[PDB]
Design a protein around this ligand. Structure first.
Ligand code: NA
Ligand code: NA
Ligand code: NA
Ligand code: NA
Lengths: 211, 211
């Protein structure tokens, strides 16, 4: 959940917002170890319910998100239903566990390619055109993350947009991401320079992967 | 419907057959002028019902077809229902009127392309990958006709098969077609030569389009 003023600005300047609960357990093994554990349901539910209770009147918020990279747990299904019950005005999405589980109204993969499949075991990232028509599937597809803009990047960006425009159910996505997470540091001469992972003695760290 | 022996051979050698009613009114303007006329329902009903009564015991027949290029008329919906009722053992397909009407259990376009759309008014030919995911569509897609093998052709054939194998609901198609419809004529020397449209004094005619 963002600083309260962000939603007011989006309401006024006009930007569609996906409000996401502060829940990410990426480092767990497997990713859903905690989210599928009934003992963590209470902590998770407050992160979802208190978000909804705070931002439910903002017109800019058009979609609720259960969080990020926490696999797919029964806690997600429970909280998904909680929202649908409390606020039927907004669709609920969540990418964890395969991007098309029972906890999301929208097929929302991260980095699924336009034409090329990535048949990872359990959590495959199908070509987005193919994903749409898998037997039984009918939901819309909007990538929660795509076109990773790390450094000299965004190659193949036009391929996505040609697809978004030709396929009615391919409704876009959110580029990753807006601003480099670099921090300022000063050399002996007092001159500032852009720093990243490990430049503060922090270790282990993931170097430039924060930009 | 073919010579009765054809089905016996397909039963024994093993070939899946699409048994098609002898109904094509391509030359009408518009194409469904007769098929939407209840006065031609009796004549059309006999061509469909008598086909089913004759061939319903052949295992090789797995799909019934209401005919070809006769647009889409109410007579089609009526006969489609008649078959579903008397023989639920086989799906029913028909391409007229857009290839995805209420008269077909299978999206069966002719010459629809793999990635390229052909947005003709009323009866568009969407790219087959896109056709599958159109809002609300759930049926399987099998081209009743594709890869027109006229003369030096079949360029791009590989493109269809790459698509057929990547998309579960793209289940193939029927190439058009098997054998050139050329006829044997004899020159002065008495040597035989392959003849086509117009070589018999027939006029108007469509020349080599029969091969
Ligand atoms: Na679209
Ligand atoms: Na990163
Ligand atoms: Na297929
Ligand atoms: Na022809």
């Amino acid at each position: 959940p963002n600083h309260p003023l962000w939603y007011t600005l989006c309401d006024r300047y006009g930007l569609y917002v996906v409000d996401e609960a502060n829940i990410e357990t990426h480092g767990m093994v497997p990713m859903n170890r905690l989210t599928d554990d009934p003992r963590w349901l209470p902590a998770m539910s407050e992160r979802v319910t208190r978000m909804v209770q705070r931002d439910r009147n903002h017109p800019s918020v058009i979609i609720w998100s259960l969080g990020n990279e926490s696999g797919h747990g029964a806690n997600h299904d429970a909280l998904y239903r909680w929202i649908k019950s409390v606020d039927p005005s907004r669709p609920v999405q969540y990418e964890g566990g395969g991007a098309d589980t029972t906890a999301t109204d929208i097929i929302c993969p991260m980095y699924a390619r336009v034409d090329e499949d990535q048949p990872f075991p359990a959590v495959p990232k199908w070509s987005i055109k193919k994903w749409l028509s898998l037997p039984g599937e009918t939901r819309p597809l909007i990538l929660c993350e795509y076109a990773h803009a790390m450094g000299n990047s965004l190659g193949g960006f036009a391929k996505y947009w040609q697809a978004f425009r030709q396929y009615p159910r391919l409704q876009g996505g959110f580029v990753w991401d807006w601003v480099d997470q670099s921090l300022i540091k000063y050399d002996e001469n007092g001159n500032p320079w852009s720093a990243y992972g490990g430049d503060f003695g922090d270790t282990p760290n993931d170097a430039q992967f924060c930009m």
